[PDB]
Amino acid sequence: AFGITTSSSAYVIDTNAPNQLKFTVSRSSCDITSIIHYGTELQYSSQGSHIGSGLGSATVTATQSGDYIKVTCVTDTLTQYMVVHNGDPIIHMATYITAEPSIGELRFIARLNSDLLPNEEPFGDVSTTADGTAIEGSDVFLVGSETRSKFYSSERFIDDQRHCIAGDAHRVCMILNQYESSSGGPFHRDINSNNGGSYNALYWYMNSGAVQTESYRMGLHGPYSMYFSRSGTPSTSIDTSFFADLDIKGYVAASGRGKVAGTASGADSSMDWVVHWYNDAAQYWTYTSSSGSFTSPAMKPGTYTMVYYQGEYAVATSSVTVSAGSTTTKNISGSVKTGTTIFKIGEWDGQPTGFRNAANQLRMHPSDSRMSSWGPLTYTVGSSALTDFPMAVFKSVNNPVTIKFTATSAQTGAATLRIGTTLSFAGGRPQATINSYTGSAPAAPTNLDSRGVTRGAYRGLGEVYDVSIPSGTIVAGTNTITINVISGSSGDTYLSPNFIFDCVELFQ
């Protein structure tokens, strides 16, 4: 029957789902200590499913409100909610914070039976580290001859509405339709799952320090839903609007929200367009249609910075104000401006898309034998393919990158060499030499204080470095460009100072 079973140590919640879903919440810690789906225990026995590594101690209450059950867990700076609806095999959750947890990240981890749930979806065993020997920190491993990491399960938050772990008789999915209180914008990615040897972890990283570009946000994180299936795959269309009737701290209902609608125009039509709204309280995003038409998600009232991207490259920024119950009409327009192009390597999309090893880097370590050679490589304009240009240059692996190009007599005037990047590590930035002319050494970029390129990430501050080339420095015939990564810092192989390329363009 739908309801709550009370004992001194626990509340047992029965969702009354057709294929059965019951779970046990500790009244001492708020740990989920047992999960019964279709007559089968799914919870790892030695450690609970919980926020972080566990709340430790919490004040736990459980109440039925019509066809809903709410479990509330109160600590000093965090309130954890679990909500179920009669008939649905779902544990709906939301996490209210007034301060960032001590550890400096905010996550929910489900530690589940890896014999019953061995697989990870949608990316497969790239994040399966079971039987692995560590090759970097405590988070990148070699399993046989293949490099593996929990980070290789990651996906851009804009595209991460569902990820799962699964077996032949059970599937458990996170359904994530509310990233408003997260950090780092639409293109932030984070740890999704990890079959690590003792159990298979299913995550939602609400926020973290992994390649983090923004301050953390307080208030209500989520809702988020953990769906339990036999062999079905749940739709991401899951109503959580009933949260409005449960006195959930920090919850703002549809009625307390407004929208921004309009048309974006002017950017590169060969790329997907994204519009992004943010302030200290909340962040929102949407893809536009091919015509540039967009409507924001339902937004908390206030004033927002508004950004228009082609791919992940920002072409325009504006400001907009949102009021509850109202749609603000606001257009946005912009384009990437350079000049008369001599050569262009890559595209202005804020990504290393198309570069050597770019596709592999999302799902394996740079040291993996399946990677193509990092270099040092010589790229020759008009002969080399884009997949012959390294997605990243490391001070102590493939430094420097050499570019050969042909110029006509008409192209010997003044020019700008533009070196667009996505993400730096350990102070890495380019210094360029063109023939016998050496550009200035740019200062160190802002340190993001985390690994990235070795953990399937690339979305940084997107620093762009221009080098002014005087007239008569470019010559008719063959020219040589050398791109060195410089930094006062040092490291072994892929942990040496480095940056990931976005685009390299020479224009006049």
Ligand SMILES: [Ca+2]
């Ligand atoms: Ca690019």
